[PDB]
Amino acid sequence: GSDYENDDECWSVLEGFRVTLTSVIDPSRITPYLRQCKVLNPDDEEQVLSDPNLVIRKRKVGVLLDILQRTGHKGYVAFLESLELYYPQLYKKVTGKEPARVFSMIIDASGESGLTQLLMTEVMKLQKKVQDLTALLSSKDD
Amino acid sequence: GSDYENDDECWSVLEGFRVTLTSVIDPSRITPYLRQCKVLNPDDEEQVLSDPNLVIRKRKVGVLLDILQRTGHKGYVAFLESLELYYPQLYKKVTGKEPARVFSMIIDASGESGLTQLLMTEVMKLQKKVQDLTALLSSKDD
Ligand SMILES: [Zn+2]
Ligand SMILES: [Zn+2]
């Protein structure tokens, strides 16, 4: 079957890629989204955000996988929820195929209006990010 | 602010800013949204995109206002809602206050999953525009 089971061993497809996941991904951006999926506890995001910066990001994602696997297949798909939104190429490599978009986890967990609020604020951050980049683009250090 | 009745009288709020809305807005980004708002028909998106560039973008939104006036309050709310997502400062000036967040129109029209998919792709067009600007913030004509 296609991963329909619910167990911690589900992570096998992500684990052999954690070498890249720890050096590329920053839990400091994805941990509030993992709250919406109801897999990540408030204690988990606190202990990972013990450093608010991206200094210890290598050990952050490493312990974060070990955190989300405590909920089994739940934390697996939840990591994919945050991943397909924030790191799409990281999903493409861990699975070997295109973004599936199994966002029915966060839909069931936080609600359709929950994910609508998430995406709606993310497009405002991105609308802000466009003017943020063209501001520094118009005046560089060359 | 806003109203409940179905007529051209509904538009009188947006009319005072019409000259700015027609020169600033591009139907090319708001037309696929207005499809899911169920106010814009497959003929209208064609007539405004008859010019692929920004050559006559002034009269594109001008004729689009007339399209959405046929549906009175439907097209009024739909233009507000697309303006609220795509042009936040234009919505801010036309209403006189912060985004009210009356996305309940496209929620009732295309469903919560409809707007969730529109926002999930909207973040990718913004990831495209943000990568477009960091590409130059990485390397310019200098
Ligand atoms: Zn699984
Ligand atoms: Zn009205």
Swiss-Prot record, chains A, B:
Changing D43R: Abolished homooligomerization and formation of BCL10-nucleating filaments. Residues 99-116 are annotated as: Linker. Zn(2+) binds at D3, C10, H73. Changing R35E: Abolished homooligomerization and formation of BCL10-nucleating filaments. Changing R101Q: Disruption of the linker region, relieving autoinhibition and leading to activation of NF-kappa-B. Residues 6-98 form the CARD domain. Changing C10A: Strongly reduced zinc-binding. It comes from the Eukaryota. Ubiquitinated at Lys-125 via 'Lys-27'-linked ubiquitin by TRIM62 downstream of C-type lectin receptors activation; leading to CARD9 activation, followed by activation of NF-kappa-B and MAP kinase p38 pathways. Deubiquitinated at Lys-125 by USP15, inhibiting CARD9. Changing K58D: Abolished homooligomerization and formation of BCL10-nucleating filaments. Changing R35Q: In IMD103; abolished homooligomerization and formation of BCL10-nucleating filaments; reduced cytokine production in response to C.albicans infection; reduced production IgG antibodies in response to C.albicans infection. It is found in: Cytoplasm. Expression is restricted to several populations of phagocytes, such as macrophages, monocytes, and dendritic cells. Highly expressed in spleen. Also detected in liver, placenta, lung, peripheral blood leukocytes and in brain. Changing I107E: Disruption of the linker region, relieving autoinhibition and leading to activation of NF-kappa-B. Constitutively forms BCL10-nucleating filaments. The modification Phosphoserine is found at S2. Changing Y91H: In IMD103; does not affect formation of the CBM complex but impairs formation of a complex with RASGRF1. Changing D66R: Abolished homooligomerization and formation of BCL10-nucleating filaments. There is a cross-link at K125 (Glycyl lysine isopeptide (Lys-Gly) (interchain with G-Cter in ubiquitin)). It is linked to Immunodeficiency 103, susceptibility to fungal infections: An autosomal recessive primary immunodeficiency disorder with altered immune responses and impaired clearance of fungal infections, selective against Candida. It is characterized by persistent and/or recurrent infections of the skin, nails and mucous membranes caused by organisms of the genus Candida, mainly Candida albicans. Monomer. Homodimer; homodimerization is mediated by the CARD domain which forms an extensive interaction with the adjacent linker and coiled-coil regions; leads to an autoinhibited state. Homomultimer; polymerizes following activation, forming a nucleating helical template that seeds BCL10-filament formation via a CARD-CARD interaction. Interacts (via CARD domain) with BCL10 (via CARD domain); interaction takes place following CARD9 activation and polymerization, leading to the formation of a filamentous CBM complex assembly. Adapter protein that plays a key role in innate immune response against fungi by forming signaling complexes downstream of C-type lectin receptors. CARD9-mediated signals are essential for antifungal immunity against a subset of fungi from the phylum Ascomycota. Transduces signals in myeloid cells downstream of C-type lectin receptors CLEC7A (dectin-1), CLEC6A (dectin-2) and CLEC4E (Mincle), which detect pathogen-associated molecular pattern metabolites (PAMPs), such as fungal carbohydrates, and trigger CARD9 activation. The linker region, also named autoinhibitory interface, is required to prevent constitutive activation and maintain CARD9 in an autoinhibitory state. Disruption of this region triggers polymerization and activation, leading to formation of BCL10-nucleating filaments. This is Caspase recruitment domain-containing protein 9. It comes from Homo sapiens. The gene is CARD9.
